[PDB]
Amino acid sequence: ALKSMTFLLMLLLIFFYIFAVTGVYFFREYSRSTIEGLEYNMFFSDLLNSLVTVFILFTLDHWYAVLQDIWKVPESSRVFSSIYVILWLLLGSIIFRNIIVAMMVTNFQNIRSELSEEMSHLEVQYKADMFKQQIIQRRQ
Amino acid sequence: MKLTPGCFLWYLYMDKIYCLLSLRNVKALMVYFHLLDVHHRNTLNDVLFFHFLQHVTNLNKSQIGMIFDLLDWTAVGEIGFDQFYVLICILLAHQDHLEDHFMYRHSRPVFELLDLDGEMNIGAANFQNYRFLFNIKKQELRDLFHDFDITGDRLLNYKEFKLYTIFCTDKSID
């Protein structure tokens, strides 16, 4: 199955790349704001930190708490940023989880199909086998 | 008797299966085996067979060991005189061009020589051993295996192998 992992992980990592590097400078006013009371500021600060926080968003743990802690940013009518991060998390999570489970159930499907065709060929060969055995018995 | 009736029948079958029956080829093989069989116990050790193969055919040590392992079906650590004669007839001056067609004709069953397993199916290891014994390209062997595996199970049937051998003989004759 991980041999069949040829192009799906490439698309996964490249969507990770484009969305993370896009979301670096979207909530830029979060870490680079002078608010004293904040505790998720380090999430969006560095590029490696951006990778960490979009990995967290992909895993989808405390996205409500994360958005509430980015709600401390001055709310600019949520016109682009909140919808961007929400669409990214939902689309990436559901699309990639679904595509990997679909590929692996197809892997099980073709494993069982190959097994079934091998047993069917074995049974066909056995049928020809006792048919030729009857032919040999009559030929004697 | 002319060195037992079974060997006479085998020589008659070889003469009916080959254009030239040679002169005292079986006698020469028996003399070579008797020289190789030091104890005259109707068997030869692996060292004697390897030395004879290196002196006659100049084969590699690994190839000689593989040939001895394939020929010695009893797995008793020794090769019989009949097995040595069968191997020498299977070689039959394999460097000649007509020897390839003779090996394509193979023997009366012409199925069990490649099938070392004996379960009426020749795997990839048997094909590799045959390509080691008889010189053939890896790409050509893979193409022939793909042509033979009609079902795709990587197994060669006796009827399928016989049909492939008949087609190869017909193509080589024409």
Side-chain angles (χ1 to χ4, degrees), chain A, chain B residues 5-6 28 65 75 77 80 93 109 118 123-125 152:
Chain A
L2 68 95
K3 180 245 178 192
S4 71
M5 210 46 58
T6 318
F7 323 102
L8 299 109
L9 259 178
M10 173 153 279
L11 200 71
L12 193 133
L13 67 95
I14 209 73
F15 269 160
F16 172 86
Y17 180 30
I18 60 140
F19 271 94
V21 83
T22 321
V24 170
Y25 296 147
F26 267 130
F27 280 127
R28 210 206 49 79
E29 207 208 340
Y30 185 34
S31 308
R32 299 127 297 267
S33 272
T34 74
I35 291 296
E36 257 315 299
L38 268 175
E39 73 91 8
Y40 274 177
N41 258 359
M42 182 76 187
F43 273 69
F44 279 63
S45 67
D46 204 23
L47 168 83
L48 189 124
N49 279 343
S50 153
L51 300 195
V52 169
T53 191
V54 301
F55 260 127
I56 283 149
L57 290 178
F58 202 64
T59 58
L60 268 189
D61 49 314
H62 277 197
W63 96 267
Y64 181 53
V66 156
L67 256 286
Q68 248 161 351
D69 220 359
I70 312 176
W71 271 132
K72 320 289 171 216
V73 183
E75 176 181 336
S76 62
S77 315
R78 76 112 197 180
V79 81
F80 69 101
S81 55
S82 74
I83 204 74
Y84 157 76
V85 288
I86 279 174
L87 190 96
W88 145 241
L89 59 92
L90 79 92
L91 168 93
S93 314
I94 74 176
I95 282 305
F96 280 120
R97 177 201 62 245
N98 289 25
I99 218 175
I100 303 301
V101 300
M103 173 222 49
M104 162 175 208
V105 294
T106 319
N107 292 142
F108 219 103
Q109 284 341 287
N110 58 64
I111 284 160
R112 160 160 28 76
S113 83
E114 228 206 318
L115 264 160
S116 294
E117 75 101 22
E118 291 175 290
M119 321 325 297
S120 161
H121 174 266
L122 255 294
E123 290 298 274
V124 161
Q125 284 286 117
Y126 209 71
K127 290 300 161 295
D129 188 80
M130 65 299 268
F131 186 43
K132 93 181 57 164
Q133 281 275 357
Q134 299 169 348
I135 287 170
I136 286 173
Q137 283 164 340
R138 179 38 44 202
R139 272 185 174 182
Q140 268 170 322

